[PDB]
Design an enzyme around this catalytic site. Structure first.
Site, mmCIF file in Angstrom:
data_model
loop_
_atom_site.group_PDB
_atom_site.id
_atom_site.type_symbol
_atom_site.label_atom_id
_atom_site.label_comp_id
_atom_site.label_asym_id
_atom_site.label_seq_id
_atom_site.Cartn_x
_atom_site.Cartn_y
_atom_site.Cartn_z
ATOM 1 C CG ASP A 57 -3.640 17.953 -26.111
ATOM 2 O OD1 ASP A 57 -4.350 18.975 -26.230
ATOM 3 O OD2 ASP A 57 -3.033 17.405 -27.060
ATOM 4 C CG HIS A 142 -10.353 -9.725 -24.372
ATOM 5 N ND1 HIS A 142 -10.810 -10.941 -24.830
ATOM 6 C CD2 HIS A 142 -9.174 -9.963 -23.793
ATOM 7 C CE1 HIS A 142 -9.939 -11.885 -24.508
ATOM 8 N NE2 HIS A 142 -8.934 -11.311 -23.885
ATOM 9 C CD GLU A 143 -6.508 -7.303 -22.873
ATOM 10 O OE1 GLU A 143 -6.355 -7.870 -21.771
ATOM 11 O OE2 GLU A 143 -6.215 -7.842 -23.963
ATOM 12 C CG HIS A 146 -8.425 -10.627 -18.820
ATOM 13 N ND1 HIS A 146 -8.737 -11.959 -18.640
ATOM 14 C CD2 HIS A 146 -7.923 -10.524 -20.062
ATOM 15 C CE1 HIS A 146 -8.452 -12.631 -19.747
ATOM 16 N NE2 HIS A 146 -7.949 -11.781 -20.616
ATOM 17 C CE1 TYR A 157 -6.005 -15.585 -19.197
ATOM 18 C CE2 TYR A 157 -3.687 -15.954 -19.683
ATOM 19 C CZ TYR A 157 -4.939 -15.508 -20.077
ATOM 20 O OH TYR A 157 -5.152 -15.003 -21.328
ATOM 21 C CD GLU A 166 -7.996 -15.017 -23.077
ATOM 22 O OE1 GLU A 166 -8.608 -14.607 -24.099
ATOM 23 O OE2 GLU A 166 -7.300 -14.281 -22.346
ATOM 24 C CD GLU A 177 -17.477 -5.591 -31.993
ATOM 25 O OE1 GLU A 177 -16.270 -5.640 -31.651
ATOM 26 O OE2 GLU A 177 -17.969 -6.308 -32.901
ATOM 27 C CG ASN A 183 -20.515 -1.372 -38.933
ATOM 28 O OD1 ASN A 183 -21.621 -1.466 -39.479
ATOM 29 N ND2 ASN A 183 -19.707 -0.341 -39.125
ATOM 30 C CG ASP A 185 -17.746 -8.572 -35.618
ATOM 31 O OD1 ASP A 185 -17.198 -8.895 -34.538
ATOM 32 O OD2 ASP A 185 -17.226 -7.816 -36.460
ATOM 33 C CG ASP A 226 -2.445 -19.823 -25.365
ATOM 34 O OD1 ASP A 226 -2.240 -18.679 -24.893
ATOM 35 O OD2 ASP A 226 -3.574 -20.240 -25.713
ATOM 36 C CG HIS A 231 -5.216 -16.768 -25.772
ATOM 37 N ND1 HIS A 231 -4.072 -16.831 -25.004
ATOM 38 C CD2 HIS A 231 -5.761 -15.563 -25.537
ATOM 39 C CE1 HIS A 231 -3.937 -15.692 -24.330
ATOM 40 N NE2 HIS A 231 -4.953 -14.904 -24.641
HETATM 41 CA CA LIG Z 1 -15.780 -7.997 -32.847
HETATM 42 CA CA LIG Z 2 -3.599 18.862 -28.930
HETATM 43 ZN ZN LIG Z 3 -7.528 -12.306 -22.617
#
Ligand SMILES: [Ca+2]
Ligand SMILES: [Ca+2]
Ligand SMILES: [Zn+2]
Ligand SMILES: [Ca+2]
Length: 316
Positions: A57, A142-143, A146, A157, A166, A177, A183, A185, A226, A231
């Site tokens: 940038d 989450h990712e 892993h 997996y 998972e 979170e 907020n 949950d 899946d 999942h």
């Molecule tokens: Ca959430």
């Molecule tokens: Ca910029």
């Molecule tokens: Zn996953």
């Protein structure tokens, strides 16, 4: 790249303003030198070759709508890094401050995100089902979780071990979170899922069945979709973790909640010290029982709650 550490500002996917750690050398790069061996965010430019280009940038301001997914991927990777470090004394996903790499603008209208073995990758969504998936802190964590699992338990997996894999990601995703505390949950992906529909999410930990996921072993999926329902069957473990933290009565079995911190401690210990690549749900129960015993003692409320929670979901 070699350069000096600077601080940019931009807006994330949900239009919220935040400071980001950058590196200056001719351009301002999405390269955070303040965490381990660095956090690096790349532009995949609507293509599928990875990682793409280190995000550059001109002015260190990231307020374009094109910028938003990068801002969030970068910022949330830093939050997740801080969670593992401050909460579990873990330095990055490998425990030795490995560089965290993310690519955004992957493909066109791609309604998913994943860890590819080396890095995180986020689609922009199609605008209908999903907006840019890095807009969800629970998704980012989450990712990255892993990556943690891969370097620790290494749960295969597929089938039951896959569903555990998972669940661990959903659990830590949620715990991250809560740690950032905006907020929070027990739902997964609410911030980025279906912009036209309020109050929904991709999956629920408090009530898996809301989205058709099993909440008891008797309801396990045994087909081949899946990867044998990784999942889907995760709902059984998600429910167990929710019960351990929050308490409740489920199919008539009562669980005394012990709270999120103790949940995190027990599962982190199980993941890093007891689970193996082929662990099934029953081995998970045993791993969690042993973790809880190590931490709180054989006769503790914590051990009793783990046992009750697994009982409630029909995992013996
Ligand atoms: Ca959430
Ligand atoms: Ca910029
Ligand atoms: Zn996953
Ligand atoms: Ca929605």
């Amino acid at each position: 790249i070699t350069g000096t550490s600077t601080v940019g500002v931009g807006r994330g996917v949900l239009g919220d303003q935040k400071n980001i750690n950058t590196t200056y050398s001719t351009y301002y790069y999405l390269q955070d030198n303040t965490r381990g061996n660095g956090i690096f965010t790349y532009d995949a430019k609507y293509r599928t070759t990875l990682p793409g280009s280190l995000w550059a940038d001109a002015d260190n301001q990231f307020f374009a709508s094109y910028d938003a997914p990068a801002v969030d991927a970068h910022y949330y990777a830093g939050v997740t890094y801080d969670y593992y470090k401050n909460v579990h004394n873990r330095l990055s996903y490998d425990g030795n401050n490995a560089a965290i790499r993310s690519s955004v603008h992957y493909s066109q209208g791609y309604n998913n995100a994943f860890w590819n073995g080396s890095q995180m990758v986020y689609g922009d969504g199609d605008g209908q089902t999903f907006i840019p998936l890095s807009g969800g802190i629970d998704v980012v964590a989450h990712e990255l979780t892993h990556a943690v699992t891969d370097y620790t338990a290494g749960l295969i997996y597929q089938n039951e071990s896959g569903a555990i894999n998972e669940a661990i990601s959903d659990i830590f995703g949620t715990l991250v979170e809560f740690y950032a505390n905006k907020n929070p949950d027990w739902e997964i992906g609410e911030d980025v899922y279906t912009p036209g529909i309020s109050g929904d999410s991709l999956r629920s930990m408090s009530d898996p069945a809301k989205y058709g996921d099993p909440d008891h072993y008797s309801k396990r999926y045994t087909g081949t979709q899946d990867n044998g329902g990784v999942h889907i069957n995760s709902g059984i473990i998600n429910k167990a973790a929710y019960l351990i933290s929050q308490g409740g009565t489920h199919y008539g079995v009562s669980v005394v909640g012990i709270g999120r911190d103790k949940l995190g401690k027990i599962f982190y210990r199980a993941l890093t010290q007891y689970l193996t690549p082929t662990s099934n749900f029953s081995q998970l129960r045993a791993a969690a029982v042993q973790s809880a015993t190590d931490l709180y003692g054989s006769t503790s409320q914590e051990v009793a709650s783990v046992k009750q929670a697994f009982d409630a979901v029909g995992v013996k």
